[PDB]
Swiss-Prot record, chain B:
Full protein: residues contained: 101 to 250 of 1049
Protein name listed in UniProt: Multidrug efflux pump subunit AcrB
Gene from which the chain derives: acrB
Outcome of gene disruption: Loss of susceptibility to contact-dependent growth inhibition (CDI); inhibiting cells still contact the target.
Protein's organism: Escherichia coli (strain K12)
Subunit relationships: Homotrimer, with large domains that extend into the periplasm, interacts with AcrA and TolC. AcrA may be required to stably link this protein and TolC. Interacts with AcrZ. Part of the AcrA-AcrB-AcrZ-TolC efflux pump.
UniProt record similarity statement: Belongs to the resistance-nodulation-cell division (RND) (TC 2.A.6) family.
Highest classification ranks of the organism: Bacteria, Pseudomonadati, Pseudomonadota, Gammaproteobacteria, Enterobacterales
Length: 1042, 150, 50, 100, 50
């Protein structure tokens, strides 16, 4: 510390070293919008063409849920059994489990489960994936001149782009939205019946005439002695044309006439599946989802992606343009840009405060150097600890500026103060002052991290979110203090100009600072006044209690969030039709929406991406969803041109004047998170029960949460309701009687109404699927069942009406499971001014009232929340106990710390006041705000009480005198910090444009807190130190000593 | 864990060359101990249920969660889960001139789940207004349905 | 840990057992390690008193 | 028995397509055979974790699976840690009544 | 060679290309490490240049 004051160049070398490691970490550091926050989830996805909810549940689902044993750090397991034939089993794991090892363990347990599966499923492919739901970007592909259909497009994507972009550097995962080409073979039941043939014969025809056959080799090993030839045998070759598939022979007739495939059915290159149809502003469209590589730079990935797309543009088919419906990227561009704006301006304001307070340029050049250096270092500390430049860590730093800023000022001022006070040379004035604030700086480092570290050890997604801030901010602070004991002291002692004893510059100059008298007088006004209060402290203790009770009331009466919502240039609106509707009926609605956004929001909306077949609540013809992209914020001025008002007017629009449910909404910034005042309750079938009993339980509970509007709100089931389903009861006897093989009935029924995966063909060099299914017109209406005949054993055709009876029934379109057992998912949120917890406990009360075999459970958002919240009081007990012990160290009292801990409510009342008048919410950013504020006020009181203790013990001055003096000599820097600070935070508090939700959230709480905190500390800290000290020792006394 | 992965990725080249009987009865690969950490008991005090009833409650309501509990390698059943047990009479079979084989094929035939399809299916014809599931042959449920098997 | 967690799962299932289905605990390597080490803590505090 | 030009765009390129988001991949090279074999090699940044790498590769490949042939599926596709140099070659011969 | 025919090195000459590429960056950093070090022990800013 002294060491460097006699060695400016060594310090310069440490600064250069920290700046270069920070420069290095800056050049080669990951940037992402957010860190990994959410628990790892791996999902097994499988499809069973034509099957019903109970089929896939009881043939695939339960077989997998049973074969999923002994996989490490399993948290919970959920599944969806879709009557559109897909099954999805999601295993969400313990936080911080190896994503990659978890996934591997799952995929090799499924791989042993595979043989116990149906062969349709086994050949359709079972897939295993890592589940984020954060695609860096969603790129669209369209055709202008109406030249190609959606499947055509989809195929172009798959065949010409998807692979180069997966070679585009920084791109981790590519995912296809749409359907690849398939060989579509559409049977005519009539022209099938004519020729006395079944789908069965079609299937066998295609399996047989299209394959690759193990052929062999000429001159094979071991050849005969003297052999002369070696080459390959090429045999029966898979088909390639639609034509060649037409020419496949199905039966030769009695008269030598041929039955070709071409004859019984239409044959066309067509979609692999037709559930989902996507339209980009009414035009035909298909698309890609790009995920950011692990550790990659988001902005560079995006730049490369757009570069690759342009690199392909000269080779596109006519009218095939790429469009960008979803990009997280420009928002991160602007967020990062705005935080940098803040840091450089804060430096500007600290320079301007430091001039318009010390009006000496070479002084004002010291903290100008310090912070740039410390920041650069924290980036290197992060990079060291494996973090990235993201929203959480950057607003972690914007907060840290204040602990960095003060730390430099505290030092230089104390040098300035000593030179103008005692008349020392620059350097020897430095040793006086460094020697004075040294222990104070070491103490502040230990107490500041005593509050900033424990909050890191929070568990869960909440805990991870804190860990980002806690680490960023603490390291910023430790480096600032090392810099304040090595570099700034070195920069003071060397370049700072000597000031004549008893100077204070009162007037002396004409043009620049007639201010100094103005200031001087006043700091006397103030100290005169503080002494004034030190007589009658009692009344002042009273005022304080008033401040505290008012504060706690402010705290209780303030609402918590998780994060603030953001216009992200993008939001989406969701569409849900009455059960059983048509692909085309849903489609009508979505065509209407697309037009609304392209009309009554002509100016705000850039594009509407409607998807029919996928929505939020499920898959099906029945549901659609519309992803809506917005014109850049540069062109959207007012408060009405923003998402709040936009989604407001879209929902206001689609609610009265509609026949189906259409909500329009914006997504949380962390795209997979806790609906703050919400929750996720699981209703569980536990005994040998049936779906009916469970549903009755569910309705019963809906009625009882309907009974508590004072606690509970909009509590809803998150499934799809039982629909009318069509039952075909086969009489085994009748059919065995007429001579028809049961398989023939089942599989022609199959290949007719469900379709079937038959074979593979090699199209343009890419192996694709072959599907044999009905034509449309012969499988729509129940009565069409009739056009279909089974060839019996002997040689005769048989109507389904010969052996099949039919009816309508109810069944479920979506069968849910939780942890191996039948479940029903229930969502919910808390009453208006109530807690999430109360609503959750009342939920447990309602559910405990439910019938036998029906238990209950919690999942997801309320898992992470219900287990990771018993922790805050404990970690804050660590914080207070540890801080008191630190300050107890720094001084030498078990009691003198209380004078500086008593300052905390002075800053809090400032934020709580600052928020409530702004109508903001006690969220994370406001919390980090509180800790930051507490951090400065403790800094300030630790310095005051330090000087107090120092004048009392090492100059024998009296209590009232030493405190008075201390409060006097540090009035000036308190005010310097707070002036610069309040001015730097001011922009964050008055911002709109991108991200301004976050900015205001940080800024407000803190600004208000700072204001009340200093303009209260400079009166209350003296009273603390005095009144505390007057419950100590004996004689000394009020002191005059040697 | 990596050892487990390395073993199982050779097990997987061995699998297709195995019997279908073994293969569908299930192959497991595990990192277990050697002795039992603990043995959990279930009894019925009031004698109301037999041993198999119980073995079934244990296997059907507990053992899947206890085997998903993190840190549990292997579970061993002292008992067994329920099955549809079909106990053949060699005489009463010879009477009707039938073989076990015929039983096998029969049960495979009258008891299964079927890919059925959908009314108003995708991709439908213009203006279609109904979408609903076809439910065909379903798996059996009672002992009787198995008796009534033709 | 594994054992305390397993006791948690069984406890989770206990209300839903058939009439007369009690769990019994015939064998557990666990209580010996717990009470065995607990004796050793008993001793360290005793020895401090001595 | 399949031919080279077949196995390259039916198995090879179908497998190379999924080696995106593979951490620390230096370069990727492959061979496609008329003797019916196909082999794709991923060489990694020096010090990438070998076992962890195997994990990631086999976990992108197992997703490439739905797009490959069933003969391929039944004789087995393996994912393995590969050198390129023989540490040593042990020889065996027979001295007397020379077995073959 | 004609348009569309490019090149690369792999294995021995990839690694050789990397030794190449790295020597200059190695000399800047290693040289700057010594300058900043001597500037340290021998407090003069001048002893390095000499
Ligand atoms: C940059 C931040 C600063 C902005 C400050 C905003 C203004 C509000 C702060 C003023 C509060 C202190 O106000 C101060 O109160 C005490 C009274 O107890 C006064 O003290 C006076 O009254 C009491 C009598 O009851 C006497 O013991 C004392 O002799 C007398 O001086 C001070 O003369 C007065 O100046």
């Amino acid at each position: 510390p002294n060491f460097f004051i006699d060695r400016p160049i060594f310090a310069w070398v440490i600064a250069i070293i920290i700046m270069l490691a920070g420069g290095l970490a800056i050049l080669k550091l990951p940037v992402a919008q957010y860190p990994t926050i959410a628990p790892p989830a791996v999902t097994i996805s499988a499809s069973y063409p034509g099957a019903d909810a109970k089929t896939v549940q009881d043939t695939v689902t339960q077989v997998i849920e049973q074969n999923m044993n002994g996989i490490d750090n399993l948290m919970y397991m959920s599944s969806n059994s879709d009557s559109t034939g897909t099954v999805q089993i999601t295993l969400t794991f313990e936080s911080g489990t190896d994503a990659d090892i978890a996934q591997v363990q799952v995929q090799n347990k499924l791989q042993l489960a595979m043989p116990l599966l149906p062969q349709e499923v086994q050949q359709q492919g079972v897939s295993v994936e890592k589940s984020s739901s954060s695609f860096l970007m969603v790129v669209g592909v369209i055709n202008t001149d109406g030249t190609m259909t959606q499947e055509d497009i989809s195929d172009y994507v798959a065949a010409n782009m998807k692979d180069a972009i997966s070679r585009t550097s920084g791109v981790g995962d590519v995912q296809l939205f749409g359907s690849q080409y398939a060989m579509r073979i559409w049977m005519n039941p009539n022209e099938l019946n004519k020729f006395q043939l079944t789908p069965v014969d079609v299937i066998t025809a295609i399996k047989a005439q299209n394959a690759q056959v193990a052929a062999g080799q000429l001159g094979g090993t071991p050849p005969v002695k003297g052999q002369q030839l070696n080459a390959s045998i090429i045999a029966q070759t898979r088909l390639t044309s639609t034509e060649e598939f037409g020419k496949i022979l199905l039966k030769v007739n009695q008269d030598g006439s041929r039955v070709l495939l071409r004859d019984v059915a239409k044959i066309e290159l067509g979609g692999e599946n037709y559930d989902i149809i996507a339209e980009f502003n009414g035009q035909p469209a298909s698309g890609l989802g790009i995920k950011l590589a692990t550790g990659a730079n988001a902005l560079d990935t995006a730049a490369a992606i757009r570069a690759e797309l342009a690199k392909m543009e000269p080779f596109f088919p006519s009218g095939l343009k790429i469009v960008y419906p979803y990009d997280t990227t420009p928002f991160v561009k602007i967020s990062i840009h705005e935080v940098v704006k803040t840091l450089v301006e804060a430096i500007i304001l600290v320079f301007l405060v430091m001039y318009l307070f010390l009006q000496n340029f070479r002084a004002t050049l010291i903290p100008t150097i310090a912070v740039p250096v410390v920041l650069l270092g924290t980036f290197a500390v992060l990079a060291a600890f494996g973090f990235s430049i993201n929203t959480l860590t950057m607003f972690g730093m914007v907060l840290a500026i204040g602990l960095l800023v003060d730390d430099a000022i505290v030092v230089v001022e104390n040098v300035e103060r000593v030179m103008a006070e005692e008349g020392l040379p620059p350097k020897e004035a430095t040793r006086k002052s460094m020697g004075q604030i040294q222990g104070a700086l070491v103490g502040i480092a230990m107490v500041l991290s005593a509050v900033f570290v424990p909050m890191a050890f929070f568990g869960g997604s909440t805990g991870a979110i804190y860990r980002q801030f806690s680490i960023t901010i603490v390291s910023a602070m430790a480096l600032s203090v090392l810099v304040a004991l090595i570099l700034t002291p070195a920069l003071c002692a060397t370049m700072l100009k000597p000031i004549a004893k008893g100077d204070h510059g009162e007037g002396k100059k004409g043009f620049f600072g007639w201010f100094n008298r103005m200031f001087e007088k006043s700091t006397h006004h103030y100290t005169d006044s503080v002494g004034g209060i030190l007589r009658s402290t009692g009344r002042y203790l009273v005022l304080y209690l008033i401040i505290v009770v008012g504060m706690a009331y402010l705290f209780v009466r303030l609402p918590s969030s998780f994060l603030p919502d953001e216009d992200q240039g993008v939001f989406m609106t969701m569409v849900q039709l009455p059960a059983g509707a048509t692909q085309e009926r849903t489609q009508k609605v979505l065509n209407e929406v697309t037009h609304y956004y392209l009309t009554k929001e002509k100016n705000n909306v850039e594009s509407v991406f409607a998807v029919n077949g996928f929505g939020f609540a499920g898959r099906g013809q029945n549901t659609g969803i519309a992803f809506v992209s917005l014109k850049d914020w540069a062109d959207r001025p007012g408060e009405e041109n923003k998402v709040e008002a936009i989604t407001m007017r879209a929902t206001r629009a689609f609610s009265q004047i509609k026949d189906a449910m259409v909500f329009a909404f914006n997504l949380p910034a962390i795209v997979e998170l806790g609906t703050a005042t919400g929750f996720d309750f699981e209703l569980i079938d536990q005994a040998g029960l049936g779906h009916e009993k469970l549903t009755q339980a569910r309705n019963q509970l809906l009625a009882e949460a309907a009974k508590h509007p004072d606690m509970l709100t909009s509590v809803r089931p998150n499934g799809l309701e039982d629909t009318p389903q069509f039952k075909i009861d086969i009489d085994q006897e009748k059919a065995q009687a007429l001579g028809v093989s049961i398989n023939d009935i089942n599989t022609t029924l199959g290949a007719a109404w469900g379709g079937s995966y038959v074979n593979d063909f090699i199209d343009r060099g890419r192996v694709k699927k072959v599907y044999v299914m009905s034509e449309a017109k012969y499988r729509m209406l129940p009565d069409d069942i009739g056009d279909w005949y089974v060839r019996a054993a002997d040689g005769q055709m048989v109507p389904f009406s010969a052996f099949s009876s039919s009816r309508w029934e109810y069944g479920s379109p979506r069968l849910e499971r939780y942890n191996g057992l039948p479940s029903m998912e229930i969502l919910g949120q808390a009453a208006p001014g109530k807690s999430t917890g109360e609503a959750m406990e009342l939920m447990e009360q309602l559910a405990s009232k439910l019938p036998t075999g029906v238990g209950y459970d919690w999942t997801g958002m309320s898992y992470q929340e219900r287990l990771s919240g018993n922790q805050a009081p404990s970690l804050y007990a660590i914080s207070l106990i540890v801080v008191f012990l630190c300050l107890a160290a720094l001084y030498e009292s078990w009691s003198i710390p209380f004078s500086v801990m008593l300052v905390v409510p002075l800053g809090v009342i400032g934020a709580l006041l600052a928020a409530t008048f702004r109508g903001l919410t006690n969220d994370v950013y406001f919390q980090v705000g509180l800790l930051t504020t507490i951090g400065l006020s403790a800094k300030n009181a630790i310095l005051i009480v330090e000087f107090a203790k120092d004048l009392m013990d090492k100059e024998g001055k009296g209590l009232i005198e030493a405190t008075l003096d201390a409060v006097r000599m540090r009035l000036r820097p308190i005010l310097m910090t707070s002036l610069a600070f309040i001015l730097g935070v001011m922009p964050l508090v008055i911002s709109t444009g991108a991200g301004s939700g976050a900015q205001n959230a940080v800024g407000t709480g803190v600004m208000g807190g700072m204001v009340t905190a200093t303009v209260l500390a400079i009166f209350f800290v003296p009273v603390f130190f005095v009144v505390v000290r007057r419950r100590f020792s004996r004689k000394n006394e009020d002191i005059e000593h040697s």
